[PDB]
Design a protein around this ligand. Sequence first.
Ligand SMILES: [Ca+2]
Ligand SMILES: [Ca+2]
Ligand SMILES: [Ca+2]
Ligand SMILES: [Ca+2]
Lengths: 144, 11, 10
Amino acid sequence: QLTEEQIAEFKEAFSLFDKDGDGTITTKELGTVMRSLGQNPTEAELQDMINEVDADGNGTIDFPEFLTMMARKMKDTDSEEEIREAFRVFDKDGNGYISAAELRHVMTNLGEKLTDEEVDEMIREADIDGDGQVNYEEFVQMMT
Amino acid sequence: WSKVFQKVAAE
Amino acid sequence: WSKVFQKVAA
Ligand SMILES: [Ca+2]
Ligand SMILES: [Ca+2]
Ligand SMILES: [Ca+2]
Ligand SMILES: [Ca+2]
């Protein structure tokens, strides 16, 4: 859910691509911007960057297509943030691994009175590197 | 893990 | 594109 202002500043950014103000970004305008920044992408690399975002198929990027893509990237950023925050909470002592002791304290806080045997089984299911603890990458895997 | 998933989705 | 988003997020 983009706010009004978020949209307003994504419109500003879009405007810096849409040089002639017609409401679309062509391959050539994309390449004008990138050469501004000291880059020199080929036509085929430019066309692929257009095609990544062209929901139409019509050759160009209108502001709605651009915003659509920026909202997806916002929602992806915001998911990860929530997952990363969850992990930090679970990792009580903040050493970057959830221990069985830490998982049991958290599980009770969700209203699940777990024994060590059940908690250790959770560890085992999550533990891809075998170290007996849940790292951040193992947590993210379980949350997908 | 189920419930952890449920809970984090709920936020 | 993700470059553009991270500039605007910041
Ligand atoms: Ca244009
Ligand atoms: Ca289009
Ligand atoms: Ca820890
Ligand atoms: Ca592990």
